[PDB]
Structure formats: structure tokens, C-alpha cells
Amino acid sequence: TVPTEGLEVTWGNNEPYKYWPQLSTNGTAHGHPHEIILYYYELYPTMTVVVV
Amino acid sequence: YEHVTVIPNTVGVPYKTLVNRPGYSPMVLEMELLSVTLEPTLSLDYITCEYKTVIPSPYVKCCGTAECKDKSLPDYSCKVFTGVYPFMWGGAYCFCDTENTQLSEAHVEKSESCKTEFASAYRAHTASASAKLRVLYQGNNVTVSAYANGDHAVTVKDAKFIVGPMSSAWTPFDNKIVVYKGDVYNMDYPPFGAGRPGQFGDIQSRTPESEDVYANTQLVLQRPSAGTVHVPYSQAPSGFKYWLKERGASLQHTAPFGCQIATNPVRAMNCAVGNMPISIDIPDAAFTRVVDAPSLTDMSCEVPACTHSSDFGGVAIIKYAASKKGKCAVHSMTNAVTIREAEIEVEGNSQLQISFSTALASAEFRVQVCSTQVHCAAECHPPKDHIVNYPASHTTLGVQDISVTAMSWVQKITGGVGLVVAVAALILIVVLCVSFSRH
Amino acid sequence: YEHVTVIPNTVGVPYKTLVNRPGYSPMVLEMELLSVTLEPTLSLDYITCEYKTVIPSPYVKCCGTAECKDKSLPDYSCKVFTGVYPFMWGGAYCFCDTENTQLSEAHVEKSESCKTEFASAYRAHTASASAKLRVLYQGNNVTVSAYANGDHAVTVKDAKFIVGPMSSAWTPFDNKIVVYKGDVYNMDYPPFGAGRPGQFGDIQSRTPESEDVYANTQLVLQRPSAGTVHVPYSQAPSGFKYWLKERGASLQHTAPFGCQIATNPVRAMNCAVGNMPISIDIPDAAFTRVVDAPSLTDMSCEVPACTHSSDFGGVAIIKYAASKKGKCAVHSMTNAVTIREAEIEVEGNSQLQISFSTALASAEFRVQVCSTQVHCAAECHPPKDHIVNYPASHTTLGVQDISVTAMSWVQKITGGVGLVVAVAALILIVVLCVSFSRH
Ligand SMILES: CCCCCCCC/C=C/CCCCCCCC(=O)OC[C@H](COP(=O)(O)OCC[N+](C)(C)C)OC(=O)CCCCCCC/C=C/CCCCCCCC
Ligand SMILES: CCCCCCCC/C=C/CCCCCCCC(=O)OC[C@H](COP(=O)(O)OCC[N+](C)(C)C)OC(=O)CCCCCCC/C=C/CCCCCCCC
């Protein structure tokens, strides 16, 4: 699981790998209200649930 | 001109600073922390290393009982075993079939490998932070190396720089650490002179070249086995040969905040905690007078395509009318949008192009282009890749204030509810007034 | 038998502790802190020594004009003066009376003689306390030295002493200190590379052999006088020669708690703050079985003289009858009356005398000779001398246990007032009783 803090993976004697997550989502933020709330749900789930 | 700014203590992300000295064209500084280092003040407690038991040749008395001596050696232990009858290769060593007593003695001492193979137990008092920085001073990359304790002002190209102190006193190390060769471990090693057998520190020494040795390995001798001249004993194995297999991961791999660890001296590089107060002293000659810089008019923007991914997913096109040719420092008035460039060349009746990185679903930001602002607006789209290998170029998560246009649904519904409540309140208050008029 | 006790951190004052173990005769240890040392961990910042101005011979250009050249000397400064007409011993130097110029150049460097006359500014993080102790073991003085951080265990006469940690972390050193030979001053020296002219630190070097010199003496060249080839200048006098005659008082004259301060390494010796928790772990061979100890009956004490004069001003004569000759460890459990000796030979039916020091205005206390208890009572006269040169050899505590035996005035007055109050309350109760039955 890659959190927003980022993940560092060291594999054997290789140099550690670093991974960070983007703001990818399936919804759209300029369409119908269900679409935009789904978008903000995929981005920030807890915050969007509490605010709605 | 003394300028003071604070940037987050994050390595490798090129930040931006604005120095708006009045009467002079605005100055944009692109500073990038190449490395920050924390170095605790060590205080060696003792040096541990694998011991060795020193067993001199046993003394076997052909007749009568040998006498046990006494010494002050670190773990000296003597014992007298009676009734022995040793055999050598040719025949019986002792003349008489009994009454022979063997004097077995042994003690411990540091091994020869203690010079090279050893583990140092220290104490970490307080780290003297140091830093190295890259700044695009006057549009050219220059590097600045200085301490980060609020002292040691450093100069380059006549411009002073003094950085720190770090807003975070957090250090990866604890009050006690050990180092083996390049690995450092936080562990609460036993007090000197009280090492338990088998565990780490059964034998302790102040320095590798010291002669005083404290060793607690419960060396116990045992009776020779049925006509042989050996000296057997029952000693707890080395606690350091055991620790070496039982080490576990060192701080290089377990420390938080993406902390690196080095040795000679022990450091902690590129920790991500806190922010860096960086204060510059930019001389008057560095600035250019405002009349010298050009003036831009009729600026119209456009965003052909935008994507709110990290690594500068947006691109904007701005028309211009720049009067004289010169260096037009470009800047972004909005925190949420970080434009890539720091200055471009403008002259004529044409347009330019920029790149920016944002986390907003709807672009809304003002571009400071050589004292003349401009408004840019576009709809950003989500990225296609779930994860990437670099930290986000843009500032941070958009705060709850900044939603996306077509949030107008929120305003619509809240206005409708407020309107309903308003008509309800007006009806109630007019009824209350007319009922107050009764009698 | 491990026995943890605490003694006050005062140096040179003996303290008696009671080690009592069932089945063994009680043991009393007389211990006395010989010295306590605090060793700060130093992280040198920079060395300051008086500068020297290096003025090369002037370049007077005959019938021409010279030009300034730029270099990166620590405080380099050059100027060109026109219209000069210098002379020499034989005659005028330049051919023409006008159009002559002189190039004056100078900079500053550390005095290469000042590898000794330097003052070094440090930082002090924390002190590794170390203590040297003298304990009276079984009628023998044995001296023990150990670290006072509680992380050091030593041994002598097969007895293990672990001393520490210090109760108080107070140290006479601030974070930033300077040392000059034997003197050390708490002062917030200017940060590196930002020294002020004329004050301490105008010329800063990292280490006395390091070649990087930061100097801020505001050297300013001046116009040569008419017809002379000298190179005049205006420089702020050395800040270190100015400090040397304005230092003030070293810490060994200013620090509180009667602190004593030394250097190389810097130390704070014999602080009077806090208390020292000394833990003693003693073997069973040292003890003596209760049956093996003498038993004394019919102990009666008489005190012919007593004076609370800080130097054992009382003498108590104790009659006794003892079973067998032996060593009885006398002790006083009244923690206001210290007694000098810790054991005395007993035999048959004989007397003994002890010397006790108190501050009580009426000496009333119990003495445990070996295991039996005797009660002592005496009257104290105040001493005649107002001043003594040694710390008091006893302790002072709260009032309730220090009032004279002639405090009977307090009891009489309080009892009389209580009696009259009780009588008034009883009369009021009786009057209420009839008034509660008359209605
Ligand atoms: C038909 C239906 C269609 C309708 C469409 C539905 C729309 C649905 C969506 C709305 C979008 C919500 C998603 C926003 C989430 C963004 C993430 C975020 O929001 O997180 C921002 C930061 C990061 O999170 P953190 O844990 O690091 O920070 C807290 C640190 N900790 C824990 C120590 C306290 O958090 C912070 O800094 C926040 C700090 C607190 C900020 C207070 C907000 C200021 C305003 C307050 C109300 C006043 C009214 C203003 C009105 C004025 C108008 C005139
Ligand atoms: C006819 C009858 C004849 C009989 C007459 C009998 C005589 C009566 C005698 C009493 C003798 C007292 C002797 C005991 C004294 C030893 C106590 C002690 O060992 O202490 C001494 C310390 C040492 O001085 P220093 O310089 O180290 O400390 C100050 C530090 N510097 C200077 C930085 C501020 O002095 C201190 O600290 C003390 C600090 C605190 C003292 C104030 C006490 C506060 C009490 C308040 C009571 C409140 C009333 C209750 C009412 C409630 C209603 C029911």
C-alpha cells in the first residue's frame, strides 16, 4: 500500500525504490453531481464522506 | 537588502521565493535543498568485541596436591582436580597410579580481532545540523554550504546566506546508540561493569587499546576426562558473535521521515521533518531598477490542455506587449499552482508558453509577469497513472476551501435552503408582529 | 546484600549509613564524597586571535596612474591616490611634480605568533558526571572512583559500588562558553562569519591551523601625507586585545554553589547541588552473624557536656555490661544528632564514651550500640564563636522536632486555653440542653 507519505522499498542489494501516488480517479469533477461526488470520494474518502 | 523566508525541509524539490523590494523589479529565487545533515555529539561509553579464553598448560603434579594460586585477571578461575592419571603418547605421565592432582587455570582477555571487529556504544547528545543548498542566484546555479544552527553566515557572489535553525529538534537517534561498521542501532546497552553473560556486552572495554577488561562469561572449569591432559571448561559463548546474527535491521532501513544514515561521523541526511528558515542578504547591485525592467500590456492567457498530475501537467499560452526587451521574471500569485519557469525573454507582439503543476480540478490562478498580473482559468483532468517515483511538484492537497467550479451546485442548494428559511422567518415574524398588535 | 542509600552531594562531609540485615549484626558504613566533577561535551565553534594587517610596500607610479586590482584576501582593500609627490632620503622620487599616483593595498591575516594567545568559543551540551568516593569498610579506608551517571559499576574488597545518577542536572555552564587558558566565561559570542569590528570575534577562524579567516575590522586606507611614502589607514583595534582587559570574572570566581572550575578538559568540580544516590552491593562474607556479635545489657547513658558547635561539641558516657569482647557498630537513629565513630571495642562490664554533634537546643536521642537501644538526654549550651571555617557536621530540619525540652511553656499555655475553651463549650452545651427541653 502506497500512502500519500510515499513508500520506500529496498530489494536485495539494489538501491531503494521510492513510490508516490497520484490523484488518479474514474469520476469527473465537472459533470453531474453524482460524478463529482464520486470523484472527490476517490480522491479524499473520509473528508468527502464527513462533509457530505 | 536582508530577506527572510521559510521553505519546507524537503530535499530535491525546487521551491520559489519572491523578494519584492519596492522601487525594484521583483526578484524570484529558486532554492533547492540538495542535502541537510544532522550529526549528534558522540561520547564513547565502551568498546565491545569477541573475547578469548587464555588457558595455559595444565600443571599435573606427579605426587601430592598442587596449590591453587590467585590472580587479578578479568575472569580468572582456578581449580584443582585430584586423582587424575594422565597418559602421554609413550606411557603414563605420572609415576604413581593415584595421588596425582592436576592444576587447571584459565582467564579471559580481549581477542586480537578487537582492533578491527568491534562495536562502539555511544550517547547522542545533540545534533549540529548542517546543510547544502542550490540557489538560482541571478539566473545561474550556485551552491551554498553552511551550518543550520542559526549561525555561520556564508557568502557567495557578494550575497550572504544564513539558514536555520531547523524548526524541528527531532533526531533519528536516541540517547544511546551503537555502531558496528556502517549500521547504527538504538539500543539500551548494559551499564559498564554489569554485562550479562551471553547477551550483548559480556566483555566491555573503554577503548580498543585499553588494557582494563571487564568480562562476565561465567567461565567454569571441569574435570579432565579419564586419563587425558586437556583442560575443559563451560563458558557462555560470545555475546557479540551472537548479536551479529541477532542484529536485525539498522536505522538505515527503519528510521522515519525517509531518513538516511551514514557513518564516519554518524549522520542523518535528508530527513523530511520541519521547515528551513532561510534568510538571504541580497545586495542592492543584485536588483535591477523598476524603470529598467520592461512593462507588459494587453496580456491575454489561454490553456490549451491541463492535467492536475504531479510533474507540471499543465501548459498555458500568454500573449504580450512588452515594450522594451528584457528579463521578465514570472511568478504565480496562487499557492495552489506552481509555475515551472523563473524568468523568460519577451519582446514584440507575440505570445509565450509556460508549464505549471496543480492539484486543483479547476485552474484559477494569477501569473505575476513582470509587475503585471494576469488571470488564467481552465479545467484540469485527472492523471492516468496511479503512482509515480517522485514527490508531487505542486504545493499540497487543496484545502477544503478550494473545490472545483461546478461547485455552483453547493451555492444553488444552499441558496435555495436559505431562501426557504428566509420566507419562513419573514412569515413567522409578520405573524408575531400582527399578533402583538392584538389588544 | 544490595543496599541503596542517598547522601547529600556536599563534598568532604562524612555521612553514616546503616546497612541492617536480619540474621547478621548491623553494619554501618562511613562514606565521604572526596570530589565530584562535571565534564561538558564541547563542540568547538571557532578560534579568535588578534589579527595582523599585512601592508606591502606602496606602488607609486611615476608619470602615470595605476589601477586597482581585485583579490579574495580576508579583508582586502585597495585605493589609488593621485597628485602625490613622495620624497626619499636623497631627493624627490617621481620625476614630475604632478600626475603621480600611489597604489595602497592591505589585508588582514591571523597572527602566526598567535598559536598560543587564542581564546576558543565552544558549546556545552551535557555533563558526564564522575565522582571519587571514600568509604569506611570494616575499619579500613578504601577509595573508590566511578562515573556518576549511574552507568558504571566498580568493585574493591569484593564489594560493588555503583554511584549515581546525579539528582540535579544543574551545571554552571551555559550553552555558549569561551575558554582562555585557565579561565572560562559564559558569553553569547557572535555567530561565525558575522563578527563585529572592535568587539570580541572580529576575526574568527575555525581551528588555529585552519586557513580560512573571516575578519571584519573595517580597514580603511587614507591619503598619504604630503611628500612621504607611508601607508596610513584606519582600522578598528583588535577585539581580542580589547576583551583581554575587559573579561571580568572567570567562572571560578562567579559560579554559584561554591563551584570550582578548571580547564583542559573543562570541569566543574565539587558542586553543592542535589544529592548523590549511592548503591552498594556487598558480599555475605563481610557480614557477621547476630549470635556471633556481642550482646550488651543494662546500658545507661550520661552526658556531662553538650554544645551545638558544629564540631562534635558533646560527649556521652555509656555504662554497659557485655557478654563477649567484640566490635559493636554504634549508631544514632535520631536523624538530628550525628555521632563520629562507627564502631568501638566492647568487653565485660565497662564504660564507653562517644562524641556527637547536634544543633538541638536539648539533646534527646537514642543510640544503638550493637543491637540494644539506649536513650540519651542532655542540655545544650550555645557556642561562643560566631564564625567557623568548616561546614556544619550535622543537619537542620523543621521546628516541631527542634524545640527545647523547656517548650513546656507552649504545652501549659495551650492546655490552659484549651481547658477554658472546653469549659465554655460544655457550659454552652448544657445551656442548649435545657433550652432544648423547655419548649
Ligand atoms: C447535488 C449535490 C452536488 C454537491 C457536490 C458535493 C461536493 C462534495 C465536496 C466537497 C469537497 C470536500 C473535499 C475536500 C478535501 C480536501 C482535503 C482537505 O481538506 O485537507 C486539507 C488539509 C490537510 O489535512 P490535514 O489532516 O493535514 O490537516 C489537519 C491537521 N490536523 C489533523 C492536525 C488538525 O487539512 C487542513 O489543513 C484543514 C484545516 C481546517 C480548514 C478550515 C476550513 C475553513 C472554513 C471553515 C468554514 C467557514 C465558512 C467559510 C465560508 C466563507 C464564504 C464567504
Ligand atoms: C512563652 C512561649 C515561649 C516558646 C517560644 C517557642 C519559639 C517558637 C519557635 C520556632 C523555632 C523555629 C526553628 C525552626 C526553623 C527551621 C526551619 C527550616 O529549616 O527552614 C529554614 C529555611 C532556610 O532559609 P533559606 O534561605 O534556605 O530559604 C529562603 C530562600 N531565599 C532566601 C532565596 C528566599 O528557611 C525557609 O526556607 C522557610 C520558608 C518558609 C517559612 C514560612 C512559613 C510559612 C507558614 C505559614 C503559616 C500559615 C498560617 C496558617 C493559618 C491557617 C488558619 C488555621
From TrEMBL, chain A:
Cell location = Host Golgi apparatus, Host trans-Golgi network; Host cell membrane; Host cytoplasm; Host endoplasmic reticulum
Q: How does it assemble?
A: Homodimer. Homomultimer. Interacts with host karyopherin KPNA4; this interaction allows the nuclear import of the viral capsid protein. Interacts with spike glycoprotein E2. Interacts with host IRAK1; the interaction leads to inhibition of IRAK1-dependent signaling. The precursor of protein E3/E2 and E1 form a heterodimer shortly after synthesis.
Query: What is the protein's known function?
Result: Provides the signal sequence for the translocation of the precursor of protein E3/E2 to the host endoplasmic reticulum. Furin-cleaved E3 remains associated with spike glycoprotein E1 and mediates pH protection of the latter during the transport via the secretory pathway. After virion release from the host cell, the assembly protein E3 is gradually released in the extracellular space.
- This chain belongs to which protein, by name? Structural polyprotein
Native organism: Chikungunya virus
What range of the intact protein is shown?
645 to 696 of 1248
TrEMBL record, chains B, C:
Q: Where in the cell is it found?
A: Host Golgi apparatus, Host trans-Golgi network; Host cell membrane; Host cytoplasm; Host endoplasmic reticulum
- Cystine pairs annotated here are C49-C114, C62-C94, C63-C96, C259-C271, C306-C380, C328-C370
Q: Where are the transmembrane segments?
A: 417-437
Report the domain of life of the source organism: Viruses
Q: What does this protein do?
A: Provides the signal sequence for the translocation of the precursor of protein E3/E2 to the host endoplasmic reticulum. Furin-cleaved E3 remains associated with spike glycoprotein E1 and mediates pH protection of the latter during the transport via the secretory pathway. After virion release from the host cell, the assembly protein E3 is gradually released in the extracellular space.
Q: How does it assemble?
A: Homodimer. Homomultimer. Interacts with host karyopherin KPNA4; this interaction allows the nuclear import of the viral capsid protein. Interacts with spike glycoprotein E2. Interacts with host IRAK1; the interaction leads to inhibition of IRAK1-dependent signaling.
Name-wise, this protein is: Structural polyprotein
Residue numbers of the full-length protein present here: 810 to 1248 of 1248
